[PDB]
Amino acid sequence: NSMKNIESLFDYSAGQFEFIDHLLTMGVGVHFAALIFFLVVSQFVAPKYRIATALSCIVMVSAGLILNSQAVMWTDAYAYVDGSYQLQDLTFSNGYRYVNWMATIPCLLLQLLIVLNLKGKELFSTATWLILAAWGMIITGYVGQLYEVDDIAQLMIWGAVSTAFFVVMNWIVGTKIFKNRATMLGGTDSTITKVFWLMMFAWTLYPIAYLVPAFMNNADGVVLRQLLFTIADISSKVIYGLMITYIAIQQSAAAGYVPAQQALG
Ligand SMILES: CCCCCCCC/C=C\CCCCCCCC(=O)OC[C@H](O)CO
Ligand SMILES: CCCCCCCC/C=C\CCCCCCCC(=O)OC[C@H](O)CO
Ligand SMILES: *C\C=C(C)/C=C/C=C(C)/C=C/C1=C(C)CCCC1(C)C
Ligand SMILES: CCCCCCCC/C=C\CCCCCCCC(=O)O
Ligand SMILES: CCCCCCCC/C=C\CCCCCCCC(=O)O
Ligand SMILES: [Cl-]
């Protein structure tokens, strides 16, 4: 599976290699450092929304372990020989990223429907169609990327199929947001709109990284892609989580929860 990603095609200078290694290790520290934040502040969240901050904790660890795994797999696969890091063992690949998205994405969406105050049959209903839409996006995306070295034409076709799911998914998100924000408290009806525009931006970086092999097939594209994933990672999971948390705390205070009213105070 590693021989199917362009990373196995190029030698990397010490700067390109150590720069990629530093992006992955940094992502580990950022996520686990955020994990502590999401853990501590959970007490200041009412029981209604407390599950939202717990989902962020699960997202931080899920992303941290894979990023840490990517880093080690990045140092075990290459060795500095004759002035450049050259492949050695087939272990590094971007497929592990996609397997992670299968888990983190359902968590990122579910904590969005919690702060929106959805409940009952609608919560279980809107959650199933979104996840099935998300999984369809990730699976078809995992198939196309297997061809990013052999058949770029297939990468396009699968990227197109994956985009159909992505558009439908966002449409359901945007539809529920703008039809349920009036219920939110403490003025969070305004914050939830920015979160959606924060989603449309950070999430769109992934299909761009997915297309790096097409318009930049070289060692600098491997670097740009990992840089794009990093920027998108800390925006779809960290910054995104911080906003979800802020919303969960604000509505908690507006609902009469003392630990939340004393925290903001
Ligand atoms: C043969 C090739 C496969 C072709 C067929 C698979 C690909 C379908 C792709 C996009 C449409 C998916 C959307 C289908 C679901 C529409 C209903 C819906 O999503 O609404 C849920 C509701 O809004 C929740 O509250
Ligand atoms: C292969 C390429 C195919 C790409 C095709 C491009 C079409 C993109 C159009 C819209 C994006 C939809 C994003 C969802 C925006 C939410 C807006 C919404 O839901 O409507 C507001 C609501 O009705 C008020 O209550
Ligand atoms: C870590 C968090 C998230 C939300 C990862 C999300 C990934 C995507 C939104 C990926 C989308 C893709 C599409 C729309 C089509 C090309 C292939 C991708 C899977 C990269
Ligand atoms: C538990 C993971 C499966 C989730 C199924 C729900 C998602 C539905 C979306 C499309 C799934 C398509 C599965 C078949 C694709 C075959 C491609 C392949 O793996 O070779
Ligand atoms: C979950 C309900 C069933 C829908 C499952 C979705 C199946 C995948 C969607 C369409 C795939 C079309 C692209 C296939 C390209 C194959 C090219 C080739 O093999 O030569
Ligand atoms: Cl990722």
Side-chain angles (χ1 to χ4, degrees):
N1 199 273
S2 300
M3 289 297 299
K4 302 156 194 170
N5 296 124
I6 63 176
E7 284 73 348
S8 65
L9 305 177
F10 323 110
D11 299 324
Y12 303 86
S13 62
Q16 295 175 329
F17 184 90
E18 299 166 355
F19 179 83
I20 280 177
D21 187 83
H22 289 339
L23 290 172
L24 300 171
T25 60
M26 185 203 68
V28 177
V30 173
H31 285 74
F32 280 96
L35 171 62
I36 304 302
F37 180 91
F38 294 117
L39 178 65
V40 173
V41 304
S42 57
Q43 65 186 307
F44 307 116
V45 178
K48 195 184 196 294
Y49 307 99
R50 200 177 298 157
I51 177 61
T53 62
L55 286 171
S56 282
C57 295
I58 300 170
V59 172
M60 294 302 95
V61 180
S62 184
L65 286 176
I66 271 56
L67 289 174
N68 185 76
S69 179
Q70 292 280 67
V72 181
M73 290 186 297
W74 179 251
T75 54
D76 291 4
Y78 299 86
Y80 194 80
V81 188
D82 297 334
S84 71
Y85 286 91
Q86 305 180 15
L87 179 63
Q88 299 292 304
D89 175 53
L90 301 312
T91 42
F92 185 92
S93 74
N94 294 275
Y96 310 98
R97 291 260 195 173
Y98 292 78
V99 177
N100 168 37
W101 299 342
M102 292 289 292
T104 40
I105 289 181
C107 293
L108 293 165
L109 295 173
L110 189 52
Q111 73 191 145
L112 181 70
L113 307 176
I114 290 165
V115 299
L116 271 174
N117 305 279
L118 305 191
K119 63 188 63 178
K121 270 290 183 176
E122 185 174 7
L123 184 64
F124 170 82
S125 178
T126 305
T128 305
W129 288 108
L130 275 173
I131 294 165
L132 292 174
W135 283 355
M137 175 186 65
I138 306 159
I139 288 173
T140 56
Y142 170 83
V143 175
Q145 62 91 23
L146 293 172
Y147 300 93
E148 76 181 24
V149 171
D150 302 331
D151 200 333
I152 288 295
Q154 267 198 64
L155 179 97
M156 301 300 198
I157 303 307
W158 288 99
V161 175
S162 177
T163 297
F165 291 90
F166 188 52
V167 174
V168 176
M169 187 193 74
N170 294 318
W171 168 81
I172 297 180
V173 174
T175 300
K176 297 299 186 183
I177 288 172
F178 298 118
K179 270 183 154 149
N180 292 272
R181 56 168 171 176
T183 72
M184 303 180 61
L185 309 170
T188 55
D189 57 322
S190 168
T191 306
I192 195 70
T193 306
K194 311 175 189 61
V195 172
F196 181 69
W197 291 107
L198 171 58
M199 278 184 49
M200 306 299 83
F201 165 77
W203 290 56
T204 297
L205 294 172
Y206 290 105
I208 294 170
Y210 174 89
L211 291 170
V212 159
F215 64 91
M216 200 178 300
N217 187 9
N218 55 47
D220 286 337
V222 167
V223 173
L224 178 67
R225 170 148 73 176
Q226 217 62 215
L227 177 61
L228 290 171
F229 284 138
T230 299
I231 294 167
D233 247 66
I234 79 93
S235 303
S236 69
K237 315 188 188 320
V238 182
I239 298 174
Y240 177 86
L242 293 176
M243 297 191 72
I244 296 297
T245 311
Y246 166 85
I247 299 166
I249 295 172
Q250 191 64 58
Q251 296 188 104
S252 297
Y257 191 68
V258 177
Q261 294 179 321
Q262 298 177 345
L264 294 165

